[PDB]
Design a protein around this ligand. Structure first.
Ligand SMILES: C[C@H](CCC(=O)O)[C@H]1CC[C@H]2[C@@H]3[C@H](O)C[C@@H]4C[C@H](O)CC[C@]4(C)[C@H]3C[C@H](O)[C@]12C
Ligand SMILES: C[C@H](CCC(=O)O)[C@H]1CC[C@H]2[C@@H]3[C@H](O)C[C@@H]4C[C@H](O)CC[C@]4(C)[C@H]3C[C@H](O)[C@]12C
Ligand SMILES: C[C@H](CCC(=O)O)[C@H]1CC[C@H]2[C@@H]3[C@H](O)C[C@@H]4C[C@H](O)CC[C@]4(C)[C@H]3C[C@H](O)[C@]12C
Ligand SMILES: C[C@H](CCC(=O)O)[C@H]1CC[C@H]2[C@@H]3[C@H](O)C[C@@H]4C[C@H](O)CC[C@]4(C)[C@H]3C[C@H](O)[C@]12C
Ligand SMILES: C[C@H](CCC(=O)O)[C@H]1CC[C@H]2[C@@H]3[C@H](O)C[C@@H]4C[C@H](O)CC[C@]4(C)[C@H]3C[C@H](O)[C@]12C
Ligand SMILES: C[C@H](CCC(=O)O)[C@H]1CC[C@H]2[C@@H]3[C@H](O)C[C@@H]4C[C@H](O)CC[C@]4(C)[C@H]3C[C@H](O)[C@]12C
Ligand code: FES
Ligand code: FES
Lengths: 356, 355
């Protein structure tokens, strides 16, 4: 009857409609895990207002908002159905969405999980590769909510950059897209793995993300038996500060100018369609930039989205995590060597200290 | 029987003695693949004489020179013994050392190989993870030698995740973890340390950080995530931006946050050299660490004479022989933002080989 085990699927989220953009921006400018601003309570509303039209326009260019919730729901639905057969002692399982900056907010889902009187809660990040500004920020909200005692037992699947069925899904979607290039151009295709960039100040303090993203790439390339040559590059840089690159836009253009005009783009750090793929790569870079460069064929591997094999990966991850009795990865128990955020430490002990 | 198959083992090198330091710096400062300077031919000799005392001093702190040649030779000898047995149809195998900036120079080795009348030459880099500034520079020199062959050439240009490479590192990590007090073992944090790159190199498209990241992952899987870790970067010089957390700052930041038990792992080199014996062992493990409040800092032993490592070497060459590959798929892609006209010529040198 009643749900026994909740799986909290964590993601940043993105505005479902144009009307949701302002509040999405506002919550995010108010997050000190993400940025510290002078007179932040004053500037955040002000910044959210000045950015709103530009960002609304981007979502307009993709049909009016983000498909993130729909994909997350469908993936969660499939995960639960599998998990009830695979793990009948922890069943009935139930998935909750906890988005960081849009509705169902992390705090709302945790509230609902508590109401449902679950025996067990699992914090399951949907970022395979761990960043403190991504998964860490999501785990920080969970600790903060209880600080602002659980009545359920908590653990986290805080990273999974090389899960073997994640890797197969990526390899499968790549091979699928390679087949859409003209046959004569197939061997000539260069693969650009593309992940949201980070500011160097984040990279330089110890963030796990670039090294983990690199690991996902190697695994996909082994599985593909190095059929095409590749580079891992980074997108979504903003402002004048240095970020990790090489930049995805610059690389497409760089490569084109060097005679490599057939390019396959691979969103390697996300599991669903969102602004980064549908607007940034598909419109901003594939349509505009690439036309101006004389590109012959640019394409983008399909996001994992509703791949039934990705649901199987999710369930396998949850099932394995339940059998292992782990509370968090070994990696979580180590903070960035130059972490200056007092909460990271509290969030880690929140998980390592759980009864059970 | 005359040698049939030569394996050219490519490394930057390092000065064997104190007297070798000046010419080591001079060749580095003359190399435009590495560095473009105003009035370079005037300044290179001048920078080389200015840096010589300080760099000699570092080698004097480690006994008077680099052991690179000795380890490269032992590794070479072991590889060749295995290869004559493993692959008789390509036998007599012979190894050559081609250092980029010290004797046997790349150009001297190639001249000896040609003179020995070998049927084939394999350019075998000793950097598992490819950088255009390490392996790439080595392959550029081979191309440029002939531009300034009587054997069929090919390259083993990268091998960042060879299964027996990975085992050697895992083996050496585990043996080093045994040397901590038992009660401190689970608390040990592992810092994987690789020579850094300027951001201008990284941002250009350099393949090295992602390959170095791949090696770290494989070793950590083999170790079943027994300890927590970070990949950090050493050997930054000058005021420009360079990649990734610095190794020295990470040791210090970690001590300050209660993580005082640290295993350092040289993940991007296969032998002892200035980076391990001086920078890690003396500059950080002795001086900085005293200054910090460290309880235990250790460094995993370099692969050096591990007989499993010469087995990796032989296995790599044997599979390369059986596969008939001229170079990796990766080498056929130059950096998206490469502004060096040779890289493309060096690639075609290899992709275009007869055979
Ligand atoms: C770089 C930063 C990661 C936080 C950090 O590591 O410092 C990320 C996390 C969420 C990102 C923001 C969100 O995607 C929302 C905005 C999206 C726009 O496309 C750019 C600005 C925008 C405001 C982003 C800027 C920046 O890239 C943010 C803030
Ligand atoms: C200095 C500070 C960043 C803090 C830091 O990284 O150290 C920056 C980041 C965003 C900036 C603000 C935003 O760019 C929005 C405004 C833009 C105007 O051009 C200047 C004032 C303005 C109100 C900025 C003032 C200030 O320079 C802010 C608040
Ligand atoms: C793009 C926007 C400013 C636009 C405006 O003037 O309204 C600014 C406001 C706050 C900025 C962020 C904050 O200054 C905090 C971060 C500071 C880092 O040095 C760069 C990324 C970083 C995450 C910034 C990226 C970008 O420059 C942001 C997102
Ligand atoms: C990585 C960088 C080359 C720049 C590049 O990536 O192109 C390397 C290659 C060889 C290096 C140099 C050589 O190791 C010799 C010198 C050694 C000293 O310890 C530092 C300065 C010194 C002069 C080095 C500085 C720098 O890190 C160099 C120049
Ligand atoms: C201009 C060049 C950096 C090249 C670049 O921009 O990429 C730098 C690097 C090392 C410098 C030189 C060396 O450091 C040695 C000299 C040091 C003196 O303090 C200035 C002159 C001096 C002769 C330098 C002139 C110039 O600033 C050089 C040649
Ligand atoms: C440290 C030494 C300057 C010593 C001196 O003042 O005499 C200089 C000489 C040439 C320099 C290098 C060259 O300028 C080329 C490289 C340029 C990058 O911007 C930084 C690293 C880079 C590899 C430099 C590192 C370092 O500052 C070097 C190696
Ligand atoms: S910023 Fe990474 S642990 Fe605090
Ligand atoms: S610099 Fe990498 S290929 Fe030229």
């Amino acid at each position: 009857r009643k749900p026994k085990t909740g799986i909290l699927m964590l993601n940043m989220g993105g505005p479902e409609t144009l009307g949701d953009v302002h509040d999405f921006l506002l919550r995010l400018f108010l997050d000190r895990d993400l940025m510290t601003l002078p007179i932040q309570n004053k500037l955040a509303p002000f910044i959210a207002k000045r950015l709103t039209p530009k960002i609304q326009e981007q979502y307009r260019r993709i049909g009016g908002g983000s498909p993130i919730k729909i994909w997350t729901s469908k993936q969660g639905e499939g995960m639960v159905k599998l998990l009830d057969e695979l793990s009948p002692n922890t069943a009935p399982h139930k998935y909750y969405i906890g988005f960081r900056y849009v509705h169902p907010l992390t705090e709302e889902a945790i509230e609902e999980m508590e109401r449902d009187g679950l025996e067990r809660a699992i914090a399951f990040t949907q970022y395979p590769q761990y960043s403190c500004s991504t998964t860490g920020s999501s785990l920080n909200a969970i600790y903060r909510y209880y600080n602002q005692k659980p009545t359920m037992k908590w653990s986290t699947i805080d990273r999974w950059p090389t899960h073997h069925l994640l890797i197969q899904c990526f390899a499968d979607h790549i091979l699928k897209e390679l087949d859409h290039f003209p046959l004569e151009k197939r061997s000539e295709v260069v693969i650009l793995f593309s992940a949201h960039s980070l500011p160097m100040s984040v990279v330089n303090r110890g963030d796990p993300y670039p090294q983990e993203v690199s690991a996902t790439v190697q695994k996909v390339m082994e599985r593909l038996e190095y059929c095409n040559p590749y580079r891992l590059v980074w997108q979504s840089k903003v402002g004048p500060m240095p970020w990790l690159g090489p930049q995805t836009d610059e690389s497409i253009k760089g490569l084109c100018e060097r005679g490599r005009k057939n390019i396959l783009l691979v969103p390697i750090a996300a599991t669903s369609d969102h602004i980064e793929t549908l607007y940034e790569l598909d419109i901003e870079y594939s349509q505009v930039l690439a036309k101006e460069c004389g590109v012959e064929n640019i394409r983008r591997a399909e996001s994992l989205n509703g791949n039934p094999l990705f649901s199987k990966a999710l369930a396998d991850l949850v099932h394995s995590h339940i059998q292992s009795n782990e509370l968090c990865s070994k990696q979580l128990t180590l903070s960035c060597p130059l972490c200056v955020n007092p909460v990271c430490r509290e969030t880690k002990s929140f998980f390592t200290s759980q009864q059970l």
